[PDB]
Write a protein that binds this ligand. Structure first.
Ligand SMILES: Nc1ncnc2c1ncn2[C@@H]1O[C@H](COP(=O)(O)OP(=O)(O)O)[C@@H](O)[C@H]1O
Ligand SMILES: O=C(CO)[C@@H](O)[C@H](O)CO
Length: 528
């Protein structure tokens, strides 16, 4: 059998990564270009420039273009067989934007295979330093956007999110306000995802519905740009964005540039690029009723949503593997640092003793409940440690083992309560995917399984955006919108079952979840 494959790209904050996935849906090749290490002339740290104000965070667009030259030439030098690539897709670090100068599409459509991309596109950008997801300098544009469309809730119902500083519309509004000459000289605005797709097409790619939802611009229901949001951000913005498309769209064939320079087959299809979190959702193969918990410095919840309920917290996006439905992200600032601090304070400085504390305590923790927010939390907006005993009295401390369970049960009950607030419901078919450092702890995943009353599976997500992108490319080849994504990726490696809810978990948490939710509201009302 000749080995056919799809490429899955990731234009990330710190690097450009690629995976090659074969027709049996196995990864057989991976490569990357690290920005600080491989393009040090740009002077980035973590792939970005943090500006003097401590809020403006950007990346040079030509660094991303040049990184693509380096990685393609690094693949060629390793003997990678580009003639086997049937299709490609990719992921882009979300929210980041690219501003193409007037006349740049002529340079894209007239690329010569004798030259590199960086050389040929060096004068194509009206903005050299692109805002990225880490930028937090647009608070005034956020408040202006919300006020213009009738408020924070009105903006979320419409776009799936209230105004967030990193969301593209607020960044576009600042560039227009502070550099109106460069904005007037911009013919096209892309996301990192659609910018990367444009490079492979040798023409402008549209923005997909899923990454297009991370801008405070797209009407997530109607799948059209909100005229009110467009007008409140910057003038003539719709023509600079172009109509958005379903994520499972063949946006074109690969440019002849890649055919002639690297030996891609002329029939290689470019499937629309999407955001890195939507691509990881595809990579993890979430379906209706499923949830993914990414445990790390920040804890991230990925939800499948048939019918969303946009809120002042979280982000609802159009679903990348099912354009009729949605997905959501909920981010928790107090993640792995709290779990480490509580371990070090309450048990021996090891994860084994943390697990023994969970093994030596009952489900429900005897009615002892805890909230652990040493840094200001996002979901919800609370700071401090708040402990309550079985009589709902506020207490100064717990015994060490009770503390460990109060943290872990509390953190997972909060994820369930906040997911449910966005319209998520546990179903009979529900599978929980857990990833990150803490997913290596069986006792922690047992609490997660017990709290949701659903089985927990463990998966490696180091390349989930790359892998999800290659799956999405295969879905485009296997029939696209005519076939379900889930049927295409049935052949992919299955995740390992790590825990199933204990008998009686349902009875314990059905009574305790509403009490935890009421205590959260009590702490919140004491803040205002
Ligand atoms: N067994 C484990 N239980 C809980 N957290 C863990 C475990 N292994 C690693 N981690 C933590 O996950 C984080 C990795 O990111 C680190 O803070 C690390 O201490
Ligand atoms: O801003 C977000 C999500 O809203 C980050 O996860 C970036 O997508 C990472 O590149």
């Amino acid at each position: 059998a000749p080995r056919r494959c799809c490429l899955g790209w990731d234009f990330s904050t710190q690097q450009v990564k690629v995976v090659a996935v074969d027709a049996e849906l196995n990864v057989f090749y991976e490569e990357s270009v690290h920005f600080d290490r491989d393009l040090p002339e740009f002077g980035t740290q973590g792939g970005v420039h943090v500006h003097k104000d401590g809020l403006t965070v950007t990346s040079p667009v030509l660094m991303w273009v040049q990184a693509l030259d380096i990685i393609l030439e690094k693949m060629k030098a390793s003997g990678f067989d580009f003639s086997q690539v049937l299709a490609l897709s990719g992921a882009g670090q979300q929210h980041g934007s690219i501003y193409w100068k007037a006349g740049a599409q002529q340079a894209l459509t007239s690329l010569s295979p004798d030259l590199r991309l960086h050389q040929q596109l060096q004068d194509c950008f009206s903005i050299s330093d692109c805002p990225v997801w880490m930028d937090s300098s647009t608070t005034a544009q956020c408040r202006q956007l919300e006020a213009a469309v009738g408020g924070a809730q009105a903006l979320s119902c419409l776009t799936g999110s209230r105004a967030y500083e990193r969301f593209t519309g607020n960044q576009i509004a600042k560039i227009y306000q502070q550099n109106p000459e460069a904005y007037s000289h911009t013919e096209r605005i892309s996301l990192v995802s659609s910018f990367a797709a444009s490079l492979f097409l040798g023409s402008y790619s549209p923005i997909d519905y899923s990454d297009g939802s991370g801008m405070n611009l797209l009407q997530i229901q109607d799948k059209v740009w909100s005229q009110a949001c467009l007008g409140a951000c910057a003038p003539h913005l719709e023509e600079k964005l172009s109509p958005p498309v379903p994520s499972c769209s063949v946006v074109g064939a690969i440019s002849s540039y890649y055919v002639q320079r690297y030996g891609f087959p002329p029939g290689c299809k470019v499937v629309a690029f999407t955001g890195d979190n939507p691509a990881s959702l595809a990579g993890m193969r979430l379906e209706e009723g499923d949830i993914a918990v990414s445990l790390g410095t920040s804890d991230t919840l990925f939800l499948w949503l048939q019918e969303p309920m946009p809120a002042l917290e979280g982000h609802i996006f159009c679903n990348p593997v099912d354009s009729q439905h949605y997905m959501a992200l909920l981010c928790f600032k107090n993640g792995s640092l709290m779990r480490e601090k509580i371990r070090n304070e309450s048990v021996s400085r090891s994860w084994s003793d943390f697990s023994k504390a969970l093994q030596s305590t009952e489900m429900g923790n005897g009615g002892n409940l805890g909230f652990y927010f040493d840094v200001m939390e996002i979901t919800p907006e609370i700071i401090g440690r708040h402990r309550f005993n079985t009589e709902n009295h506020k207490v100064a401390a717990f015994p060490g083992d009770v503390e460990v369970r109060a943290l872990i049960e509390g953190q997972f009950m909060a994820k369930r309560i906040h997911a449910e607030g966005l319209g998520y419901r546990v179903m009979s078919k529900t599978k929980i995917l857990a990833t990150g450092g803490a997913s290596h702890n069986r006792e922690i995943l047992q609490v997660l399984a017990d709290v949701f009353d659903a089985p927990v599976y463990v998966i490696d997500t180091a390349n989930s955006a790359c892998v999800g992108s290659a799956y999405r490319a295969f879905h485009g080849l296997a029939g696209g919108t005519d076939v379900p994504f889930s049927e295409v990726v049935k052949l992919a490696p299955n995740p390992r079952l790590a825990a199933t809810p204990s008998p009686g978990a349902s009875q314990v948490y059905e009574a305790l979840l509403p009490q935890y939710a009421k205590l959260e509201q009590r702490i919140l009302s004491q803040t205002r």
